[PDB]
Assembly symmetry: C3
Homo-oligomer: 222 residues x 3
């Protein structure tokens, strides 16, 4: 396309679409209920991502936001995706450790705040206000990572898998507020082409990457 | 109104509104918890449909989408409805057969993809791209119907009711991708007047029709 | 700001932000699972409200709706908030009395209808149609309050707390359809400045006020 970032949105689409097929196919073979749960969640995540990367690729989820001087291109389909897939990932972590209903509530709620404010700054028109919405969104991410460390004696083919996935999450999720800040969505110090490349490498890793590690573990069984 | 399809949107509103009253009234008389569940779900479905048919009737959920040459009228309130009521129907089927949490997750997730992509093609501006979003949406419908047949020894006043409702669903739900394709939302081979007539006959049948069959069955009790 | 209602949206933001901090901090100290549940829900409610009051304050959730003659200012961020926080409050009441899944479904569903139609009239362009959407929205509020009285033998440090919270709810929630009618969103008999003052006093009371009463009760424990 006439857009420099098409290549990464094209590669994003393929990879997400590839992970869903692999996981669905892999998904075929399960009988253990609990294990079913982890396939249902893990497969839907890139399934959703698949639909939003295509929408950006065909250009449906792209808008112009006016701010800091001129008109700015902003992929909003990114947040609609994150809106559903991140709560879906925390749910994988949550049911892995037999979380409490109460803690599952807080995580999900804080998550919706995270993305929700992230979307608000993405579409905000006053340049300065954006980073205030960024701060709050970041403040919720700190809560979530906090909770999965200090508020989150279980069987060991579980614990060890959880510590692994959680390390992945914390490192990946932490990159997103950094990319957004340096990117076109935030400081504008990095062009849209690179900002799109960064998110795609995170998304595939945090989704397909995360799912592969997960759906192989014996942790997901009885 | 100045719109040819008012009559069907007017009849849609009455019928949906009539089913909700009947089901709520009928709903009054229940004590068995589990049965309560099926009244809660079954009544809310046309309740929601009721609100969206009126919005189309008063014209709040109507927009113009430019594509394939000219400006196209598109009722988007239809998808906001389907967004909530179809997961509500699968939930009726799901709890009827004591589905697994895992399978309830997949159905609902695939459903949101179905409608979600359906909405995206409805609002897409490049004529050709629409049917690509149609294909994917259809691909999710095939998953759902699949699952309720091959991934979905239970008491017989249940099994027989389930096979019935499920037959209804498969036949009705299959009509929707056909109507959308021939209709104004898709191929434009059928005018908006007829496309509105078709969806109304499906909606009332899949909702009120489906609910009547359901809320009479002894299957919904202990 | 250049807006007369800034002061109340500024005071709304502070107070909601203050309640969340207090509840989170207070939240630190819990071990009993069930009690955790009530902190998770109760704290997220003003957390969300916090984000939407700021959005109105910075002016992100403000739009112009044309009707009854001229252009009308309409804070839509108010409904996105109510969209999530009112179901969150009913859930506090619901789990307080060990509600049935079925009844929890009806309450939440009716609630989404309430706000959902409320939003539709807020954005409707034909003056008269607004109050029709107001009527239906009100009709759902009557269902909810009904249900929490006649469809909602439990331990007494519970029952007495429930009767209390419920009295709060009914009196507060009943004020909202009145404010909306006399306000700029409805009849226009009260200016936006006063209508914004009224909602802020209700919101803080129904949220922070409601939460304080709740998170002190021994009802929330085992
Ligand atoms: C499947 C995609 C994933 C796991 C995405 C994670 C995204 C985030 C952790 C988002 C973080 C953001 C902030 C905390 C600040 C505002 C900007 C965001 C939304 C990128
Ligand atoms: C209460 C209304 C019901 C049960 C509606 C069902 C609608 C569908 C099965 C929708 C199907 C569609 C596709 C599979 C392709 C894209 C167009 C849609 C959304 C009409
Ligand atoms: C946290 C905020 C609360 C508890 C708000 C409650 C709001 C309502 C009970 C809303 C009621 C309305 C109607 C019943 C008629 C239409 C206008 C509304 C949305 C204000």
């Amino acid at each position: 396309t006439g857009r420099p970032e098409w290549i990464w949105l094209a590669l994003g689409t393929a990879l997400m679409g590839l992970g869903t097929l692999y996981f669905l196919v892999k998904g075929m073979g399960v009988s253990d209920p609990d294990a079913k749960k982890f396939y249902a969640i893990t497969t839907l995540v890139p399934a959703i991502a698949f639909t939003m990367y295509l929408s950006m690729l065909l250009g449906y989820g792209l808008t112009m936001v006016p701010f800091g001087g001129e008109q700015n291109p902003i992929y909003w389909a990114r947040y609609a995706d994150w809106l559903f897939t991140t709560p879906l990932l925390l749910l994988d972590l949550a049911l892995l450790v037999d979380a409490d209903q109460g803690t599952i509530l807080a995580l999900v709620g804080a998550d919706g705040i995270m993305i929700g404010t992230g979307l608000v700054g993405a579409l905000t028109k006053v340049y300065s206000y954006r980073f205030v919405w960024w701060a709050i969104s970041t403040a919720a991410m700190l809560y979530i990572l906090y909770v999965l460390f200090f508020g989150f004696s279980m069987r060991p083919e579980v614990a060890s898998t959880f510590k692994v996935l959680r390390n992945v999450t914390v490192v990946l999720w932490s990159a997103y507020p950094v990319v957004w800040l340096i990117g076109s969505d935030g400081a504008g110090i990095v062009p849209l082409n690179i900002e799109t490349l960064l998110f795609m490498v995170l998304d595939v890793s945090a989704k397909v990457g995360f799912g592969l590690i997960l759906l192989r573990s014996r942790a997901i069984f009885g």
